[PDB]
Amino acid sequence: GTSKLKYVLQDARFFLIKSNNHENVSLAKAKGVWSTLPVNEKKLNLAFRSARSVILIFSVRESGKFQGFARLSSESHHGGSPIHWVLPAGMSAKMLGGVFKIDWICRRELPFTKSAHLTNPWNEHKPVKIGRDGQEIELECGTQLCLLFPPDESIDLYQVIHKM
Template sequence: MSGVELDLACPEIDVDDFSSVSKESIDSQSNQMQTRITQENEQYKSTLTNTIQTPIEVQSIPIHDEKQTGALQNIFHDTVYFLIKSGNEENVSLAKAKGVWSTPPANENKLNRAFRQHRNVILIFSVAESKAFQGFARMSCEARHDSQPINWVLPPGMSNRAFSGVIYIDWISRRSLPFNQTLHLFNSWNENKPVKIGRDGQEIEPRCAETLCRLFPSDPTIDILSISRKADKHKSSSRSPLSINPSKDINHRSSTSIDRHRSDVTLYLIIINRLTNLAIIFYTNLNQYRTLQKKKDVG
Protein backbone atom coordinates (compact mmCIF):
# COMPACT_ATOMS: atom_id res chain seq x y z
CA MET A 1 0.00 0.00 0.00
CA SER A 2 1.40 3.39 -1.09
CA GLY A 3 4.87 1.89 -1.47
CA VAL A 4 5.46 1.74 2.33
CA GLU A 5 6.90 -1.48 3.69
CA LEU A 6 5.74 -2.25 7.21
CA ASP A 7 8.07 -3.87 9.70
CA LEU A 8 5.60 -5.86 11.78
CA ALA A 9 8.22 -8.06 13.46
CA CYS A 10 8.60 -7.47 17.17
CA PRO A 11 12.16 -7.07 18.46
CA GLU A 12 13.73 -10.11 20.05
CA ILE A 13 14.56 -9.54 23.70
CA ASP A 14 17.02 -11.58 25.71
CA VAL A 15 15.97 -11.63 29.35
CA ASP A 16 19.55 -12.01 30.51
CA ASP A 17 20.40 -8.66 28.95
CA PHE A 18 18.38 -6.92 31.64
CA SER A 19 20.23 -8.29 34.64
CA SER A 20 21.68 -4.89 35.30
CA VAL A 21 18.89 -2.67 34.07
CA SER A 22 18.21 0.40 36.12
CA LYS A 23 15.16 2.60 36.18
CA GLU A 24 17.17 5.35 34.50
CA SER A 25 18.09 3.12 31.53
CA ILE A 26 14.46 2.07 31.14
CA ASP A 27 13.30 5.68 30.99
CA SER A 28 16.12 6.53 28.59
CA GLN A 29 15.22 3.70 26.19
CA SER A 30 11.54 4.56 26.30
CA ASN A 31 12.21 8.24 25.60
CA GLN A 32 14.55 7.43 22.73
CA MET A 33 12.03 5.05 21.17
CA GLN A 34 9.19 7.56 21.53
CA THR A 35 11.34 10.29 19.96
CA ARG A 36 12.23 8.06 17.01
CA ILE A 37 8.60 7.09 16.43
CA THR A 38 7.51 10.73 16.56
CA GLN A 39 10.19 11.74 14.04
CA GLU A 40 9.25 8.89 11.66
CA ASN A 41 5.55 9.76 11.84
CA GLU A 42 6.19 13.45 11.24
CA GLN A 43 8.40 12.62 8.26
CA TYR A 44 5.72 10.32 6.82
CA LYS A 45 2.98 12.91 7.33
CA SER A 46 5.17 15.48 5.56
CA THR A 47 5.59 13.12 2.61
CA LEU A 48 1.83 12.58 2.38
CA THR A 49 1.16 16.31 2.54
CA ASN A 50 3.58 17.01 -0.29
CA THR A 51 1.86 14.46 -2.54
CA ILE A 52 -1.59 16.01 -2.12
CA GLN A 53 -2.39 18.76 -4.57
CA THR A 54 -2.70 22.17 -3.00
CA PRO A 55 -6.15 23.81 -3.21
CA ILE A 56 -6.86 25.46 -6.52
CA GLU A 57 -7.49 29.15 -6.44
CA VAL A 58 -10.30 30.10 -8.80
CA GLN A 59 -9.65 33.14 -10.93
CA SER A 60 -12.23 35.06 -12.90
CA ILE A 61 -12.44 35.91 -16.56
CA PRO A 62 -12.47 39.71 -16.72
CA ILE A 63 -16.19 40.17 -17.43
CA HIS A 64 -17.58 43.40 -16.05
CA ASP A 65 -21.30 42.93 -16.70
CA GLU A 66 -23.13 41.16 -13.83
CA LYS A 67 -25.44 39.35 -16.24
CA GLN A 68 -22.49 38.01 -18.19
CA THR A 69 -20.77 36.93 -14.99
CA GLY A 70 -23.92 35.10 -13.90
CA ALA A 71 -24.26 33.52 -17.33
CA LEU A 72 -20.70 32.25 -17.19
CA GLN A 73 -21.29 30.81 -13.73
CA ASN A 74 -24.39 29.08 -15.07
CA ILE A 75 -22.29 27.44 -17.77
CA PHE A 76 -19.88 26.14 -15.13
CA HIS A 77 -22.73 24.57 -13.11
CA ASP A 78 -23.25 20.79 -13.40
CA THR A 79 -20.50 20.66 -16.00
CA VAL A 80 -18.06 18.06 -17.25
CA TYR A 81 -14.90 18.98 -19.13
CA PHE A 82 -12.90 17.18 -21.80
CA LEU A 83 -9.54 17.87 -23.39
CA ILE A 84 -9.73 17.85 -27.18
CA LYS A 85 -6.48 17.31 -29.07
CA SER A 86 -6.12 18.27 -32.71
CA GLY A 87 -3.29 17.25 -34.99
CA ASN A 88 -3.26 20.59 -36.79
CA GLU A 89 -4.28 24.22 -36.48
CA GLU A 90 -6.42 24.12 -39.63
CA ASN A 91 -9.07 21.88 -38.10
CA VAL A 92 -9.40 24.06 -35.00
CA SER A 93 -9.71 27.14 -37.23
CA LEU A 94 -12.44 25.33 -39.17
CA ALA A 95 -14.16 24.45 -35.90
CA LYS A 96 -14.07 28.09 -34.80
CA ALA A 97 -15.48 29.28 -38.12
CA LYS A 98 -18.29 26.71 -38.41
CA GLY A 99 -19.00 25.88 -34.76
CA VAL A 100 -18.57 22.14 -35.30
CA TRP A 101 -16.29 19.30 -34.30
CA SER A 102 -15.87 15.62 -35.11
CA THR A 103 -14.12 12.94 -33.11
CA PRO A 104 -13.56 9.16 -33.33
CA PRO A 105 -16.49 6.92 -32.30
CA ALA A 106 -15.14 6.06 -28.84
CA ASN A 107 -14.84 9.73 -27.90
CA GLU A 108 -18.15 10.57 -29.54
CA ASN A 109 -19.99 7.99 -27.45
CA LYS A 110 -18.39 9.34 -24.29
CA LEU A 111 -19.30 12.94 -25.15
CA ASN A 112 -22.87 12.00 -26.10
CA ARG A 113 -23.33 10.16 -22.82
CA ALA A 114 -21.98 13.13 -20.87
CA PHE A 115 -24.32 15.48 -22.74
CA ARG A 116 -27.34 13.36 -21.78
CA GLN A 117 -26.32 13.24 -18.13
CA HIS A 118 -25.16 16.80 -17.48
CA ARG A 119 -26.27 20.34 -18.04
CA ASN A 120 -23.04 21.38 -19.75
CA VAL A 121 -20.23 19.62 -21.57
CA ILE A 122 -17.19 21.81 -22.16
CA LEU A 123 -14.52 20.97 -24.75
CA ILE A 124 -11.09 22.52 -24.23
CA PHE A 125 -9.03 22.55 -27.43
CA SER A 126 -5.30 22.18 -27.89
CA VAL A 127 -3.29 21.72 -31.09
CA ALA A 128 -0.42 19.27 -30.87
CA GLU A 129 2.99 20.92 -30.33
CA SER A 130 1.42 24.39 -30.14
CA LYS A 131 2.35 24.86 -26.45
CA ALA A 132 -1.06 26.44 -25.90
CA PHE A 133 -4.79 25.88 -25.60
CA GLN A 134 -6.74 27.36 -28.51
CA GLY A 135 -10.04 28.06 -26.72
CA PHE A 136 -13.00 26.25 -25.21
CA ALA A 137 -16.60 25.62 -26.26
CA ARG A 138 -19.86 24.11 -25.01
CA MET A 139 -21.55 21.21 -26.77
CA SER A 140 -24.94 22.38 -28.02
CA CYS A 141 -26.20 18.92 -28.99
CA GLU A 142 -25.22 15.30 -29.32
CA ALA A 143 -23.32 14.26 -32.42
CA ARG A 144 -25.54 14.33 -35.48
CA HIS A 145 -25.29 11.88 -38.35
CA ASP A 146 -27.72 13.63 -40.68
CA SER A 147 -25.46 16.62 -41.30
CA GLN A 148 -23.21 17.22 -44.25
CA PRO A 149 -19.71 15.86 -43.53
CA ILE A 150 -17.02 18.41 -42.75
CA ASN A 151 -13.93 18.50 -44.94
CA TRP A 152 -11.39 18.13 -42.17
CA VAL A 153 -7.69 18.31 -42.88
CA LEU A 154 -6.59 14.73 -42.30
CA PRO A 155 -3.29 12.86 -42.48
CA PRO A 156 -2.57 10.97 -45.72
CA GLY A 157 -4.52 7.73 -45.88
CA MET A 158 -7.21 8.79 -43.38
CA SER A 159 -10.74 9.59 -44.50
CA ASN A 160 -13.69 11.26 -42.84
CA ARG A 161 -15.10 7.78 -42.23
CA ALA A 162 -12.84 7.67 -39.17
CA PHE A 163 -15.27 10.13 -37.58
CA SER A 164 -18.86 9.26 -36.76
CA GLY A 165 -20.92 12.44 -36.76
CA VAL A 166 -20.82 16.19 -36.38
CA ILE A 167 -20.95 17.82 -32.95
CA TYR A 168 -22.27 21.38 -32.93
CA ILE A 169 -20.55 23.63 -30.41
CA ASP A 170 -20.84 27.16 -29.06
CA TRP A 171 -17.50 28.82 -28.49
CA ILE A 172 -17.06 30.58 -25.16
CA SER A 173 -13.57 31.80 -25.95
CA ARG A 174 -11.69 31.53 -29.23
CA ARG A 175 -8.62 33.11 -27.66
CA SER A 176 -5.41 31.17 -27.01
CA LEU A 177 -3.92 30.45 -23.59
CA PRO A 178 -0.19 29.54 -23.40
CA PHE A 179 0.74 26.47 -21.40
CA ASN A 180 3.18 28.50 -19.30
CA GLN A 181 0.18 30.23 -17.70
CA THR A 182 -1.29 26.92 -16.53
CA LEU A 183 1.73 25.35 -14.83
CA HIS A 184 -0.01 25.45 -11.44
CA LEU A 185 -2.89 23.27 -12.63
CA PHE A 186 -2.84 19.47 -12.33
CA ASN A 187 -5.55 17.04 -13.38
CA SER A 188 -6.23 14.63 -10.51
CA TRP A 189 -8.24 12.45 -12.91
CA ASN A 190 -5.09 11.90 -14.98
CA GLU A 191 -2.63 10.84 -12.26
CA ASN A 192 -2.12 14.47 -11.18
CA LYS A 193 -0.30 15.28 -14.40
CA PRO A 194 -0.18 18.90 -15.62
CA VAL A 195 -3.52 19.81 -17.13
CA LYS A 196 -1.90 20.36 -20.53
CA ILE A 197 -1.06 16.64 -20.69
CA GLY A 198 -3.70 14.18 -21.80
CA ARG A 199 -4.96 12.09 -24.66
CA ASP A 200 -7.74 13.25 -26.95
CA GLY A 201 -10.96 12.96 -24.95
CA GLN A 202 -9.29 13.03 -21.53
CA GLU A 203 -11.76 14.16 -18.86
CA ILE A 204 -10.53 16.92 -16.53
CA GLU A 205 -11.44 17.24 -12.87
CA PRO A 206 -14.11 20.00 -12.66
CA ARG A 207 -12.43 22.43 -10.24
CA CYS A 208 -9.18 22.26 -12.17
CA ALA A 209 -11.01 22.60 -15.49
CA GLU A 210 -13.11 25.57 -14.37
CA THR A 211 -9.97 27.33 -13.17
CA LEU A 212 -8.37 26.63 -16.53
CA CYS A 213 -11.36 28.02 -18.43
CA ARG A 214 -11.35 31.19 -16.33
CA LEU A 215 -7.74 31.81 -17.34
CA PHE A 216 -8.69 32.25 -21.00
CA PRO A 217 -8.87 35.87 -22.18
CA SER A 218 -12.45 37.07 -22.55
CA ASP A 219 -13.78 37.01 -26.10
CA PRO A 220 -15.92 40.08 -26.94
CA THR A 221 -17.32 38.33 -30.03
CA ILE A 222 -19.13 35.74 -27.89
CA ASP A 223 -22.80 36.04 -26.82
CA ILE A 224 -22.41 34.40 -23.43
CA LEU A 225 -26.05 35.11 -22.47
CA SER A 226 -27.32 33.10 -25.43
CA ILE A 227 -25.13 30.14 -24.49
CA SER A 228 -26.38 30.32 -20.90
CA ARG A 229 -29.99 30.22 -22.09
CA LYS A 230 -29.21 27.06 -24.05
CA ALA A 231 -27.84 25.53 -20.86
CA ASP A 232 -31.11 26.38 -19.07
CA LYS A 233 -33.16 24.71 -21.80
CA HIS A 234 -30.98 21.62 -21.69
CA LYS A 235 -31.33 21.39 -17.90
CA SER A 236 -34.83 19.91 -17.98
CA SER A 237 -33.81 17.04 -20.26
CA SER A 238 -30.59 16.12 -18.48
CA ARG A 239 -32.20 14.55 -15.40
CA SER A 240 -34.05 11.55 -16.75
CA PRO A 241 -34.18 8.40 -14.56
CA LEU A 242 -31.77 6.68 -16.95
CA SER A 243 -29.07 9.29 -16.46
CA ILE A 244 -28.87 9.87 -12.73
CA ASN A 245 -25.29 8.63 -12.51
CA PRO A 246 -22.66 11.21 -13.43
CA SER A 247 -20.49 10.65 -16.46
CA LYS A 248 -17.30 9.30 -15.06
CA ASP A 249 -14.31 7.16 -15.74
CA ILE A 250 -13.98 5.28 -12.45
CA ASN A 251 -10.28 4.65 -13.00
CA HIS A 252 -9.56 8.38 -13.28
CA ARG A 253 -11.96 9.75 -10.66
CA SER A 254 -11.50 7.28 -7.85
CA SER A 255 -7.74 6.74 -7.99
CA THR A 256 -6.89 9.82 -5.95
CA SER A 257 -9.35 9.10 -3.14
CA ILE A 258 -8.21 5.47 -3.00
CA ASP A 259 -4.57 6.49 -2.79
CA ARG A 260 -5.31 8.89 0.05
CA HIS A 261 -7.29 6.23 1.90
CA ARG A 262 -4.44 3.77 1.53
CA SER A 263 -1.98 6.36 2.78
CA ASP A 264 -4.10 6.99 5.87
CA VAL A 265 -4.37 3.27 6.59
CA THR A 266 -0.63 2.82 6.12
CA LEU A 267 0.15 5.64 8.52
CA TYR A 268 -2.26 4.17 11.07
CA LEU A 269 -0.62 0.74 10.84
CA ILE A 270 2.84 2.23 11.23
CA ILE A 271 1.78 4.06 14.37
CA ILE A 272 0.14 0.93 15.84
CA ASN A 273 3.20 -1.18 15.03
CA ARG A 274 5.62 1.26 16.62
CA LEU A 275 3.50 1.73 19.71
CA THR A 276 3.19 -2.05 20.10
CA ASN A 277 6.96 -2.45 19.93
CA LEU A 278 7.39 0.34 22.46
CA ALA A 279 4.90 -1.28 24.83
CA ILE A 280 6.68 -4.64 24.61
CA ILE A 281 10.03 -3.07 25.40
CA PHE A 282 8.60 -1.00 28.23
CA TYR A 283 6.80 -3.85 30.00
CA THR A 284 9.72 -6.22 29.55
CA ASN A 285 12.04 -3.68 31.08
CA LEU A 286 9.54 -3.03 33.85
CA ASN A 287 9.35 -6.72 34.74
CA GLN A 288 13.12 -6.96 34.81
CA TYR A 289 13.31 -3.90 36.99
CA ARG A 290 10.79 -5.36 39.46
CA THR A 291 12.73 -8.62 39.54
CA LEU A 292 15.91 -6.75 40.40
CA GLN A 293 14.11 -4.83 43.11
CA LYS A 294 12.85 -8.07 44.67
CA LYS A 295 16.37 -9.51 44.66
CA LYS A 296 17.65 -6.40 46.38
CA ASP A 297 14.89 -6.60 49.00
CA VAL A 298 15.66 -10.26 49.68
CA GLY A 299 19.37 -9.51 49.92
Protein backbone atom coordinates in the same frame (compact mmCIF):
# COMPACT_ATOMS: atom_id res chain seq x y z
CA GLY B 1 -17.21 40.19 -16.68
CA THR B 2 -16.99 36.56 -15.52
CA SER B 3 -20.33 35.97 -13.75
CA LYS B 4 -22.29 34.57 -16.73
CA LEU B 5 -19.23 32.46 -17.60
CA LYS B 6 -19.11 30.95 -14.10
CA TYR B 7 -22.85 30.28 -14.42
CA VAL B 8 -22.32 28.37 -17.67
CA LEU B 9 -19.46 26.41 -16.03
CA GLN B 10 -21.49 25.49 -12.93
CA ASP B 11 -21.50 21.69 -12.52
CA ALA B 12 -20.24 21.25 -16.11
CA ARG B 13 -18.02 18.47 -17.40
CA PHE B 14 -14.78 19.24 -19.22
CA PHE B 15 -12.89 17.37 -21.94
CA LEU B 16 -9.44 17.93 -23.41
CA ILE B 17 -9.66 18.00 -27.22
CA LYS B 18 -6.39 17.55 -29.08
CA SER B 19 -5.99 18.35 -32.76
CA ASN B 20 -3.03 17.59 -35.01
CA ASN B 21 -3.35 20.86 -36.96
CA HIS B 22 -4.62 24.42 -36.71
CA GLU B 23 -6.86 23.95 -39.78
CA ASN B 24 -9.32 21.69 -37.98
CA VAL B 25 -9.61 24.00 -34.99
CA SER B 26 -10.14 26.90 -37.38
CA LEU B 27 -12.97 25.04 -39.16
CA ALA B 28 -14.45 24.26 -35.74
CA LYS B 29 -14.35 27.95 -34.79
CA ALA B 30 -15.89 29.06 -38.07
CA LYS B 31 -18.65 26.45 -38.35
CA GLY B 32 -19.36 25.64 -34.70
CA VAL B 33 -18.81 21.89 -35.17
CA TRP B 34 -16.56 19.11 -34.01
CA SER B 35 -16.12 15.48 -35.07
CA THR B 36 -14.07 12.75 -33.38
CA LEU B 37 -13.46 9.00 -33.39
CA PRO B 38 -16.27 6.78 -32.05
CA VAL B 39 -14.51 5.98 -28.76
CA ASN B 40 -14.67 9.70 -27.90
CA GLU B 41 -17.99 10.27 -29.67
CA LYS B 42 -19.55 7.76 -27.27
CA LYS B 43 -18.03 9.42 -24.18
CA LEU B 44 -19.14 12.89 -25.32
CA ASN B 45 -22.67 11.69 -26.07
CA LEU B 46 -22.96 10.18 -22.58
CA ALA B 47 -21.65 13.35 -20.95
CA PHE B 48 -24.05 15.58 -22.95
CA ARG B 49 -27.09 13.83 -21.42
CA SER B 50 -25.53 13.79 -17.93
CA ALA B 51 -24.59 17.43 -17.29
CA ARG B 52 -25.89 20.98 -17.72
CA SER B 53 -22.80 21.90 -19.77
CA VAL B 54 -20.18 19.82 -21.55
CA ILE B 55 -17.10 21.93 -22.27
CA LEU B 56 -14.48 21.00 -24.88
CA ILE B 57 -11.08 22.66 -24.41
CA PHE B 58 -8.96 22.61 -27.59
CA SER B 59 -5.20 22.32 -27.95
CA VAL B 60 -3.33 21.91 -31.23
CA ARG B 61 -0.47 19.49 -30.74
CA GLU B 62 3.02 21.06 -30.69
CA SER B 63 1.59 24.60 -30.40
CA GLY B 64 2.20 24.93 -26.66
CA LYS B 65 -1.21 26.59 -26.19
CA PHE B 66 -4.90 26.01 -25.87
CA GLN B 67 -6.86 27.62 -28.68
CA GLY B 68 -10.15 28.22 -26.86
CA PHE B 69 -13.13 26.29 -25.47
CA ALA B 70 -16.68 25.56 -26.56
CA ARG B 71 -19.90 24.07 -25.17
CA LEU B 72 -21.64 21.07 -26.72
CA SER B 73 -25.06 22.16 -27.95
CA SER B 74 -26.03 18.73 -29.36
CA GLU B 75 -25.24 15.04 -29.38
CA SER B 76 -23.43 13.77 -32.47
CA HIS B 77 -25.45 13.54 -35.67
CA HIS B 78 -24.64 12.03 -39.05
CA GLY B 79 -25.47 13.23 -42.55
CA GLY B 80 -24.90 17.00 -42.65
CA SER B 81 -22.80 18.96 -45.11
CA PRO B 82 -19.45 17.10 -45.20
CA ILE B 83 -16.77 19.01 -43.32
CA HIS B 84 -13.44 19.23 -45.14
CA TRP B 85 -11.35 18.20 -42.14
CA VAL B 86 -7.61 17.69 -42.56
CA LEU B 87 -7.44 14.05 -41.58
CA PRO B 88 -4.52 12.43 -39.72
CA ALA B 89 -2.12 10.19 -41.65
CA GLY B 90 -3.88 6.89 -40.98
CA MET B 91 -7.45 8.16 -40.94
CA SER B 92 -10.23 8.46 -43.54
CA ALA B 93 -13.57 10.28 -43.37
CA LYS B 94 -15.66 7.15 -42.80
CA MET B 95 -13.61 6.43 -39.65
CA LEU B 96 -15.08 9.47 -37.82
CA GLY B 97 -18.18 9.43 -35.67
CA GLY B 98 -20.95 11.96 -36.06
CA VAL B 99 -20.80 15.73 -35.95
CA PHE B 100 -21.31 17.63 -32.71
CA LYS B 101 -22.62 21.19 -32.76
CA ILE B 102 -20.73 23.50 -30.38
CA ASP B 103 -21.08 27.10 -29.18
CA TRP B 104 -17.75 28.78 -28.61
CA ILE B 105 -17.32 30.42 -25.23
CA CYS B 106 -13.77 31.60 -25.89
CA ARG B 107 -11.86 31.78 -29.15
CA ARG B 108 -8.71 33.23 -27.56
CA GLU B 109 -5.51 31.29 -26.90
CA LEU B 110 -4.03 30.34 -23.53
CA PRO B 111 -0.36 29.32 -23.33
CA PHE B 112 0.56 26.22 -21.34
CA THR B 113 2.93 28.36 -19.24
CA LYS B 114 -0.17 29.92 -17.60
CA SER B 115 -1.82 26.60 -16.60
CA ALA B 116 1.25 24.97 -15.03
CA HIS B 117 -0.37 25.19 -11.56
CA LEU B 118 -3.37 23.10 -12.72
CA THR B 119 -3.23 19.32 -12.30
CA ASN B 120 -5.89 16.88 -13.53
CA PRO B 121 -6.82 14.22 -10.92
CA TRP B 122 -8.38 12.14 -13.71
CA ASN B 123 -4.97 11.89 -15.41
CA GLU B 124 -2.73 10.98 -12.40
CA HIS B 125 -2.52 14.69 -11.46
CA LYS B 126 -0.38 15.35 -14.47
CA PRO B 127 -0.56 19.00 -15.58
CA VAL B 128 -3.88 19.63 -17.33
CA LYS B 129 -2.11 20.26 -20.67
CA ILE B 130 -1.08 16.59 -20.68
CA GLY B 131 -3.60 14.10 -21.96
CA ARG B 132 -4.89 12.09 -24.89
CA ASP B 133 -7.64 13.48 -27.12
CA GLY B 134 -10.86 13.02 -25.15
CA GLN B 135 -9.31 13.01 -21.67
CA GLU B 136 -11.83 14.16 -19.08
CA ILE B 137 -10.76 17.03 -16.83
CA GLU B 138 -12.03 17.02 -13.24
CA LEU B 139 -14.58 19.71 -12.35
CA GLU B 140 -12.40 22.05 -10.26
CA CYS B 141 -9.36 21.80 -12.55
CA GLY B 142 -11.47 22.34 -15.66
CA THR B 143 -13.33 25.30 -14.15
CA GLN B 144 -10.15 27.07 -13.11
CA LEU B 145 -8.56 26.34 -16.49
CA CYS B 146 -11.45 27.96 -18.36
CA LEU B 147 -11.25 30.98 -16.06
CA LEU B 148 -7.57 31.43 -17.02
CA PHE B 149 -8.36 32.23 -20.66
CA PRO B 150 -8.52 35.90 -21.65
CA PRO B 151 -12.12 37.11 -21.87
CA ASP B 152 -13.57 36.91 -25.39
CA GLU B 153 -15.56 40.12 -25.71
CA SER B 154 -16.90 38.97 -29.10
CA ILE B 155 -19.02 36.31 -27.37
CA ASP B 156 -22.35 36.90 -25.62
CA LEU B 157 -23.18 34.08 -23.22
CA TYR B 158 -26.82 35.19 -22.97
CA GLN B 159 -27.52 32.91 -25.96
CA VAL B 160 -25.63 29.92 -24.51
CA ILE B 161 -27.35 30.26 -21.13
CA HIS B 162 -30.73 29.96 -22.86
CA LYS B 163 -29.81 26.53 -24.22
CA MET B 164 -29.10 25.03 -20.81
